[PDB]
Structure formats: C-alpha cells, structure tokens
Scaffold this motif. Structure first.
Motif, PDB file in Angstrom:
ATOM      1  N   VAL A  30       0.836  -1.198   0.000  1.00 45.17           N
ATOM      2  CA  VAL A  30       0.000   0.000   0.000  1.00 45.17           C
ATOM      3  C   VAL A  30       0.870   1.247   0.000  1.00 45.17           C
ATOM      4  O   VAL A  30       0.656   2.174  -0.789  1.00 45.17           O
ATOM      5  CB  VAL A  30      -0.961  -0.008   1.203  1.00 45.17           C
ATOM      6  CG1 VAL A  30      -1.575   1.365   1.404  1.00 45.17           C
ATOM      7  CG2 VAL A  30      -2.055  -1.021   1.002  1.00 45.17           C
ATOM      8  N   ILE A  31       1.876   1.278   0.879  1.00 44.77           N
ATOM      9  CA  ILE A  31       2.760   2.439   0.964  1.00 44.77           C
ATOM     10  C   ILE A  31       3.482   2.656  -0.360  1.00 44.77           C
ATOM     11  O   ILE A  31       3.536   3.777  -0.878  1.00 44.77           O
ATOM     12  CB  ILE A  31       3.752   2.276   2.129  1.00 44.77           C
ATOM     13  CG1 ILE A  31       3.018   2.329   3.470  1.00 44.77           C
ATOM     14  CG2 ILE A  31       4.826   3.348   2.071  1.00 44.77           C
ATOM     15  CD1 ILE A  31       3.923   2.164   4.667  1.00 44.77           C
ATOM     16  N   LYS A  32       4.011   1.578  -0.944  1.00 47.82           N
ATOM     17  CA  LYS A  32       4.777   1.693  -2.182  1.00 47.82           C
ATOM     18  C   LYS A  32       3.912   2.190  -3.339  1.00 47.82           C
ATOM     19  O   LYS A  32       4.280   3.138  -4.045  1.00 47.82           O
ATOM     20  CB  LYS A  32       5.411   0.342  -2.514  1.00 47.82           C
ATOM     21  CG  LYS A  32       5.947   0.216  -3.924  1.00 47.82           C
ATOM     22  CD  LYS A  32       6.563  -1.156  -4.139  1.00 47.82           C
ATOM     23  CE  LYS A  32       6.915  -1.385  -5.598  1.00 47.82           C
ATOM     24  NZ  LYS A  32       5.701  -1.413  -6.457  1.00 47.82           N
ATOM     25  N   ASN A  33       2.751   1.563  -3.545  1.00 48.96           N
ATOM     26  CA  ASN A  33       1.906   1.929  -4.678  1.00 48.96           C
ATOM     27  C   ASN A  33       1.286   3.308  -4.493  1.00 48.96           C
ATOM     28  O   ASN A  33       1.156   4.072  -5.459  1.00 48.96           O
ATOM     29  CB  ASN A  33       0.826   0.869  -4.880  1.00 48.96           C
ATOM     30  CG  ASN A  33       1.406  -0.500  -5.171  1.00 48.96           C
ATOM     31  OD1 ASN A  33       2.408  -0.625  -5.873  1.00 48.96           O
ATOM     32  ND2 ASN A  33       0.782  -1.537  -4.624  1.00 48.96           N
ATOM     33  N   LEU A  34       0.899   3.651  -3.261  1.00 53.19           N
ATOM     34  CA  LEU A  34       0.389   4.987  -2.996  1.00 53.19           C
ATOM     35  C   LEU A  34       1.471   6.033  -3.216  1.00 53.19           C
ATOM     36  O   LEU A  34       1.191   7.118  -3.731  1.00 53.19           O
ATOM     37  CB  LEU A  34      -0.171   5.064  -1.576  1.00 53.19           C
ATOM     38  CG  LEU A  34      -0.987   6.309  -1.231  1.00 53.19           C
ATOM     39  CD1 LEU A  34      -2.075   6.545  -2.263  1.00 53.19           C
ATOM     40  CD2 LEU A  34      -1.590   6.173   0.155  1.00 53.19           C
ATOM     41  N   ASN A  35       2.717   5.719  -2.847  1.00 54.79           N
ATOM     42  CA  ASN A  35       3.829   6.620  -3.131  1.00 54.79           C
ATOM     43  C   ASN A  35       4.006   6.822  -4.627  1.00 54.79           C
ATOM     44  O   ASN A  35       4.231   7.948  -5.083  1.00 54.79           O
ATOM     45  CB  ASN A  35       5.114   6.072  -2.512  1.00 54.79           C
ATOM     46  CG  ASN A  35       5.603   6.907  -1.356  1.00 54.79           C
ATOM     47  OD1 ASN A  35       5.516   8.132  -1.385  1.00 54.79           O
ATOM     48  ND2 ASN A  35       6.122   6.249  -0.327  1.00 54.79           N
ATOM     49  N   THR A  36       3.914   5.740  -5.404  1.00 51.01           N
ATOM     50  CA  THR A  36       4.040   5.850  -6.857  1.00 51.01           C
ATOM     51  C   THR A  36       2.962   6.761  -7.435  1.00 51.01           C
ATOM     52  O   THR A  36       3.256   7.698  -8.192  1.00 51.01           O
ATOM     53  CB  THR A  36       3.969   4.466  -7.499  1.00 51.01           C
ATOM     54  OG1 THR A  36       5.095   3.684  -7.081  1.00 51.01           O
ATOM     55  CG2 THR A  36       3.972   4.581  -9.012  1.00 51.01           C
ATOM     56  N   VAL A  37       1.702   6.505  -7.073  1.00 45.86           N
ATOM     57  CA  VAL A  37       0.595   7.305  -7.594  1.00 45.86           C
ATOM     58  C   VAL A  37       0.730   8.758  -7.153  1.00 45.86           C
ATOM     59  O   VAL A  37       0.490   9.688  -7.937  1.00 45.86           O
ATOM     60  CB  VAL A  37      -0.750   6.701  -7.151  1.00 45.86           C
ATOM     61  CG1 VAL A  37      -1.908   7.555  -7.636  1.00 45.86           C
ATOM     62  CG2 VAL A  37      -0.880   5.282  -7.663  1.00 45.86           C
ATOM     63  N   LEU A  38       1.129   8.979  -5.899  1.00 46.67           N
ATOM     64  CA  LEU A  38       1.224  10.336  -5.380  1.00 46.67           C
ATOM     65  C   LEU A  38       2.353  11.113  -6.039  1.00 46.67           C
ATOM     66  O   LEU A  38       2.197  12.303  -6.319  1.00 46.67           O
ATOM     67  CB  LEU A  38       1.389  10.311  -3.863  1.00 46.67           C
ATOM     68  CG  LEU A  38       0.095  10.067  -3.085  1.00 46.67           C
ATOM     69  CD1 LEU A  38       0.323  10.258  -1.601  1.00 46.67           C
ATOM     70  CD2 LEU A  38      -1.009  10.985  -3.580  1.00 46.67           C
ATOM     71  N   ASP A  39       3.499  10.473  -6.297  1.00 44.35           N
ATOM     72  CA  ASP A  39       4.564  11.204  -6.978  1.00 44.35           C
ATOM     73  C   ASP A  39       4.201  11.476  -8.431  1.00 44.35           C
ATOM     74  O   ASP A  39       4.575  12.524  -8.973  1.00 44.35           O
ATOM     75  CB  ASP A  39       5.914  10.479  -6.857  1.00 44.35           C
ATOM     76  CG  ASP A  39       5.955   9.130  -7.568  1.00 44.35           C
ATOM     77  OD1 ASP A  39       5.695   9.049  -8.787  1.00 44.35           O
ATOM     78  OD2 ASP A  39       6.310   8.139  -6.900  1.00 44.35           O
ATOM     79  N   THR A  40       3.470  10.557  -9.073  1.00 40.38           N
ATOM     80  CA  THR A  40       2.972  10.837 -10.417  1.00 40.38           C
ATOM     81  C   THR A  40       2.045  12.046 -10.415  1.00 40.38           C
ATOM     82  O   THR A  40       2.128  12.905 -11.301  1.00 40.38           O
ATOM     83  CB  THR A  40       2.254   9.612 -10.982  1.00 40.38           C
ATOM     84  OG1 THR A  40       3.189   8.536 -11.132  1.00 40.38           O
ATOM     85  CG2 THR A  40       1.641   9.928 -12.337  1.00 40.38           C
ATOM     86  N   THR A  41       1.161  12.136  -9.419  1.00 43.28           N
ATOM     87  CA  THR A  41       0.259  13.282  -9.329  1.00 43.28           C
ATOM     88  C   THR A  41       1.016  14.570  -9.010  1.00 43.28           C
ATOM     89  O   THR A  41       0.687  15.637  -9.540  1.00 43.28           O
ATOM     90  CB  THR A  41      -0.816  13.021  -8.276  1.00 43.28           C
ATOM     91  OG1 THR A  41      -1.351  11.706  -8.459  1.00 43.28           O
ATOM     92  CG2 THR A  41      -1.939  14.035  -8.405  1.00 43.28           C
ATOM     93  N   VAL A  42       2.026  14.488  -8.140  1.00 46.33           N
ATOM     94  CA  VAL A  42       2.802  15.665  -7.754  1.00 46.33           C
ATOM     95  C   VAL A  42       3.599  16.196  -8.940  1.00 46.33           C
ATOM     96  O   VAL A  42       3.771  17.411  -9.094  1.00 46.33           O
ATOM     97  CB  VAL A  42       3.708  15.325  -6.554  1.00 46.33           C
ATOM     98  CG1 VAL A  42       4.790  16.372  -6.362  1.00 46.33           C
ATOM     99  CG2 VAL A  42       2.879  15.215  -5.287  1.00 46.33           C
ATOM    100  N   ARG A  43       4.092  15.298  -9.797  1.00 46.68           N
ATOM    101  CA  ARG A  43       4.830  15.723 -10.983  1.00 46.68           C
ATOM    102  C   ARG A  43       3.994  16.655 -11.856  1.00 46.68           C
ATOM    103  O   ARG A  43       4.522  17.608 -12.443  1.00 46.68           O
ATOM    104  CB  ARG A  43       5.284  14.496 -11.773  1.00 46.68           C
ATOM    105  CG  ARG A  43       5.939  14.796 -13.107  1.00 46.68           C
ATOM    106  CD  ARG A  43       6.805  13.638 -13.598  1.00 46.68           C
ATOM    107  NE  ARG A  43       6.094  12.366 -13.654  1.00 46.68           N
ATOM    108  CZ  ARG A  43       6.200  11.404 -12.746  1.00 46.68           C
ATOM    109  NH1 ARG A  43       6.975  11.540 -11.683  1.00 46.68           N
ATOM    110  NH2 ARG A  43       5.512  10.278 -12.910  1.00 46.68           N
TER     111      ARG A  43
END
Lengths: 49, 52
Positions: free
Chosen positions: A1-14
């Motif tokens: 959960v932490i890893k995939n949420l981090n991936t999605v969140l950094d994609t959104t932040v970009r």
C-alpha cells in the motif's frame, strides 16, 4: 500500500500544476454548461429528431 | 504495595502486548523514508484538493 500509494502520489505531484488547474477549468466548463443545460438538452433532442 | 499488585496482575498479559506492539511498530519503522515521502506527497495533493 505504501509503495503503490507513493508511486501514484509522486505521479500526481509531478503534474501538480496541471492537476490543480484542471479542477478549476472543469468546474468552470461544467457550470457554464449547467447554466444552459435545458436549451442544450432541447437542442440535442431536436437534432436527433 | 499498589505497584506490586499492579505488576503481579498485569504481568501474564504483557508479553503478548509487547510482541504485537513490536511487530506493528516495526511494520512502519523499517519504512521510515517511504512513510515520510508518502506524507510529503500526500500533503501536496491534499492541499491541492482542499484549496479547490
């Protein structure tokens, strides 16, 4: 959960600038369409008919 | 006397609590950098959502 949420969140932040602007733009577009919804729906139905 | 009674009563139920708390705390404790990065990115995205 932490890893995939981090991936999605950094994609959104970009694209944070675009993600922020698109909410306001979508709200403006949808409000403008809603203010003329009844003529728009009438026109679509008349076109189909 | 009160401390003695409390330790006598709460001792048999302490090892399981220690084990569970250790396991759950190490669940997050070995992902500190990931958790902090997640919190920062979540701060950015949630601020964007809340402002709009």
């Amino acid at each position: 959960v932490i890893k995939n949420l981090n991936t999605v969140l950094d994609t959104t932040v970009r694209h944070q600038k675009q993600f922020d602007e698109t909410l306001v733009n979508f709200e403006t577009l949808i409000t403008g369409l809603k203010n003329r919804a009844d003529p728009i729906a009438t026109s679509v139905a008349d076109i189909s008919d | 006397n009160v401390l003695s009674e409390t330790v006598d009563q709460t001792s048999p139920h302490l090892s399981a609590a220690l084990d569970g708390v250790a396991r759950f705390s190490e669940t997050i404790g070995k992902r500190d950098e990931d958790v902090k990065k997640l919190l920062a990115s979540a701060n950015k995205v949630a601020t964007v959502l809340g402002d709009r």
